[PDB]
Design a protein around this ligand. Sequence first.
Ligand code: HEM
Ligand code: HEM
Ligand SMILES: CCCCCCCCCCCCO[C@@H]1O[C@H](CO)[C@@H](O[C@H]2O[C@H](CO)[C@@H](O)[C@H](O)[C@H]2O)[C@H](O)[C@H]1O
Ligand SMILES: CCCCCCCCCCCCO[C@@H]1O[C@H](CO)[C@@H](O[C@H]2O[C@H](CO)[C@@H](O)[C@H](O)[C@H]2O)[C@H](O)[C@H]1O
Lengths: 54, 75, 438, 124, 383, 61
Amino acid sequence: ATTFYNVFVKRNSAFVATILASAFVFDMTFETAIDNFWDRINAGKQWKDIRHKY
Amino acid sequence: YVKKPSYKIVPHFLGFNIPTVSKWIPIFGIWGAAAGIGALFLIEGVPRTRQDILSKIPIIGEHWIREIPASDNPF
Amino acid sequence: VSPKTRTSNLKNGLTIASESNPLVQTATVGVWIDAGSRNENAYNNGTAHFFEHLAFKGTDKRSQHQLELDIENMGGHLNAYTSRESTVYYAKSFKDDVPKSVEILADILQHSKLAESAIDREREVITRELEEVNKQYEEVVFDHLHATAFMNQPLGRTILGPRENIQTITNTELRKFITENYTADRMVLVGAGAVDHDALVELAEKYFSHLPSSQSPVPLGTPIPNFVGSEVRLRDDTMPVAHIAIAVEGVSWTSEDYYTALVAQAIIGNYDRAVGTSRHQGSRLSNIVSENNLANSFQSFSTSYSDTGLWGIYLTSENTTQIDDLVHFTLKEWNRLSTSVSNLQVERAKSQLKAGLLLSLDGTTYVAEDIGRQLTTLGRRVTPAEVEAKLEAVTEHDVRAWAQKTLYDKDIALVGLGPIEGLYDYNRIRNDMSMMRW
Amino acid sequence: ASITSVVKTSELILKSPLLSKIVVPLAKTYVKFSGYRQLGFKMNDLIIEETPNMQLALRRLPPTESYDRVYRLIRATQFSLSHKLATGNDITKPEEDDHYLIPYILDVEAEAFEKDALDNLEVV
Amino acid sequence: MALRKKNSLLNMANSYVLDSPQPSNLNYFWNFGSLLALCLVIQLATGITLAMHYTSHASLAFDSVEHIMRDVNFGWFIRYAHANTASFFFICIYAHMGRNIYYGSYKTPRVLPWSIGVIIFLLLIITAFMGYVLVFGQMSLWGATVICNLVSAIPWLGEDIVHFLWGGFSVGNPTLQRFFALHYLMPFVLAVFALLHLIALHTAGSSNPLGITSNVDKLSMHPYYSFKDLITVFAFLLMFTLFVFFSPDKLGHPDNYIPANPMVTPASIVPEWYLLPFYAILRAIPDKLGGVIAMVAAILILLILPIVDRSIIRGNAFKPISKLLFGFFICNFLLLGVLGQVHIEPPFIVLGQICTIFYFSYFLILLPMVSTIENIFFYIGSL
Amino acid sequence: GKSTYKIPDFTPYLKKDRNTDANRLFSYFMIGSFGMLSAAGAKATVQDFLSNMSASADVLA
Ligand code: HEM
Ligand code: HEM
Ligand SMILES: CCCCCCCCCCCCO[C@@H]1O[C@H](CO)[C@@H](O[C@H]2O[C@H](CO)[C@@H](O)[C@H](O)[C@H]2O)[C@H](O)[C@H]1O
Ligand SMILES: CCCCCCCCCCCCO[C@@H]1O[C@H](CO)[C@@H](O[C@H]2O[C@H](CO)[C@@H](O)[C@H](O)[C@H]2O)[C@H](O)[C@H]1O
């Protein structure tokens, strides 16, 4: 907790760098998660689900 | 017995000296990383950024290698 | 090189400590006690201060008047003060009046009457003291500062105590306090100036030998304080000068960072517009404040107790539209102890302190106060050679590391008194404890 | 540039016999063609004043020098707006072109520069 | 207390146009600021009116401008006023900048109004360039093509940026429609920056031609400078009248009366006259990216005048050598302009390179040297 | 009600572990998360919005 504070939080330069890196990770993972969830709740309905017939 | 105080003037310019600036060198480094991460994040959607930078990152890089099937592409 | 401090014990556990100066003709002998207001609870808060008044109100032998005469005849004077952790009772006299003075001190401490009639008389005098401290602005500020920093804890209580206690303090609770606290293992008999150590030890064996010892003798200067970031605003638009104190939790007497905290305090330093040299001081804050007329004065402090401390600054200003600038620039100078200080500032402050710690001791009372304070807080007098070595061990890395854990982005206790409309709210002050650029 | 700089470099030139022999006549012609004397100014009236150091030097002028400088600025302003030149006693003669301000600004700057140096001292 | 001082809104106007304390000796070169404000007001009035009749679609743009000329009542006047005032705007802005450079208006304590001024100048260039494309004649198209292709020089991403600006693979309808939206916006941004540089100036006040303080002798802005501004307003309106009514196309290129044709390339593709010196600077450097950097640096280098001018005295009125150097600098700037519109042929290729070197060496070498020496001549010469 | 050295009761609000690094770190985790979603939201907003200026579907056709 002290260690974590000292490395990532105490210096604002480090804090902002950590926030931006986390935003990058969040953005990429959230995209993938939503895409999969969207595909499950709308299963059989989307073009990708019927494409194979054609 | 001491006749005179013992000191030197360190080189300075615009109120900066090397001892002080040296303490901030690492901070410029981290700010540069922050600016780099942020810039790259801003242009992550640009196709060239994916093609040239992001897809080349080991393991992770396959996140940015995505092909539209030829059947689904009007263009 | 100053003469060696000699130290002896009695059987009860009373320490005798002396430092002779064959160049002076006066002597300060007295009793330093490792006890003070902090030893009271909430119900008897004010007792230690009450006792200090009664100590001079007559003993089993000498009445109030006889006491007065005896001291008058000695030729010197007696003095006492009670603090949160320390009580002192000393006598300044002529070289050959030392046996009289030791005898009077031993009498007023061990054999005081504490007569109901005198309790009742002082009960009014002390009640009047509650309405006249109000004028001593620095003391008002520091007492509120302790009250808020150590909210609802023993260090947070005042020395005078509440009005309610003053009306209900009995001779019973006075006697109980001094019986529990003024024990031989907590007391040091100190002599400085024209005193012989061996003479003083004999006088101690004569007068202080029948002192109670405590059941469980802990070492001298033995104590958990939980600092509260907080503020007290005592706005008074009719006052022309604003008085502001800002402090963080500091270091105890025996902290490993004790010298690092002193060096950091010396980097900010003091300032007073009325002193001629103050416009030329090296301190950055001093330069900002003097160039911009932001303050009449400021004084950095690093107060220590047995188990905590307060480190901070006390400011006075008539510039009521730029209090914000004054506070802003002060806290930005503190930020630089974490971000920017180098060997340049650190070596300059060490130079100034190596002399400062010796300069302070320029009279027998100052020497006695130094022996007494060190013996009751550390258990020993630290030689100037050891002090020079501990100061030399402070590096710029130590200062930055200390400031990063003690100052940087930490809660402050803040007290403002007077025309402080321009002092911003807690958040805006506390936001200056860090720098977004770093 | 600082007045200190200008004064020191000028003194180096005035020391060297060769250099002074060639620079002093040029400087005198320059001043004649400059033509500030034809608006009744002294050279020091032209120095930029909107600086902390210069404001402090001006505050240290003796009252008489200060009141006369105010008049020369007002008079020159009136010649400027009228598109006229000074005549007669309003023209600054070479012997009246005294460096009234230079000593004050050199003292202000001496302290300012010493303060900068001493802010950078390193205990040895 | 008078209402003009008591009411906060009135007092803002009062502080800038009425009680504003001015030096009593401003000469006529202090009138370009109000002429620039006049040009800006004319461009807003005529520009918004043209927007009521213009169509930004590439199939209709050029014809909508002909409709304005032929069918809209007084459309010819509104169009020619807008087109000619764009040139007058640049004459006044060069005069205002030349005044500022000669009189040391960039020196402390006026660095901030000068620096915001440099941005105003960049916004005016962008505004005028986009407005010229809107006609969609041959010069409109081909000028947009070559100027927008300079962005291709930006390393790595340059080509992508160009396609992004165009909204396609060449200058076409998407580019024209976006240039219309931005051309409408940019004058409002320019007005905000013009206001910012005045607010920044208000802390020191106007400089004056002697370079000394005016705190000793102030005049109200009104009535003195109000009435002195009317003289140059009417002089400007006379010049405006002679171009707009008697020679409306003197400052233009005939090729812009031919509809844009991506196939046929015009004989010579040149920017409007006011951009010509920067174009000559770009041609001087053989490298594409080098040329673009030089061209931008030629404007941004104005930001270093506060540093490279080492004089202890503000302005050139009393500095004969600085006055000569300034004369050569200005004439060189005009020669660069001329060289921007000659053909890339001998001997103009080398001459353009020499003039480019002179342009930069003014800021980097000559002004620092001359200002150093003049400091010494003032000191020694008056001992 | 009269003495100003008797601090009013703040026990309903005061945290016991107020001086600890864990205490500060928690509040900065909230601030940091908020800053992180604001960064991710700004990036998404800017990217989707500015893409309007890239070649439209009819142009790419
Ligand atoms: C600083 C202000 C402005 C400048 C320097 C400027 C400059 C120009 C230029 C150079 C042209 C090409 C003129 C031609 O040759 O036909 C033009 C065209 C145009 N401008 Fe502006 N303009 C400005 C403000 C405005 C404003 C505020 C509008 C509001 C929409 C606007 C609308 C137009 C329109 C519609 C055209 C195309 C019709 C035409 O060519 O006349 N302009 N502008
Ligand atoms: C829309 C364009 C502009 C307008 C409307 C404008 C307007 C004005 C006005 C009204 C003044 C005060 C009167 C005067 O001295 O003439 C002024 C002063 C000034 N302007 Fe501008 N300006 C513009 C562009 C620029 C540019 C491009 C620069 C610099 C590159 C600039 C730099 C300054 C400076 C330094 C002053 C102070 C000059 C002094 O009084 O000594 N301005 N401007
Ligand atoms: C030129 C276009 C005309 C419109 C004016 C521009 C609108 C924007 C102006 C407001 C920006 C704030 O501008 C600021 O206003 C206040 C009061 O108005 C001025 O204040 C000044 O005038 C008032 C009285 O007139 C005095 O109390 C004050 O001592 C003086 O500094 C500032 O010098 C000016 O910098
Ligand atoms: C200063 C900021 C820096 C420059 C700003 C960059 C501007 C343009 C960046 C990329 C814009 C286009 O970048 C592109 O964005 C869209 C989302 O908008 C993404 O497209 C993704 O989502 C959209 C809808 O959200 C879907 O229709 C699409 O099938 C999917 O791939 C692309 O994966 C990305 O390649």
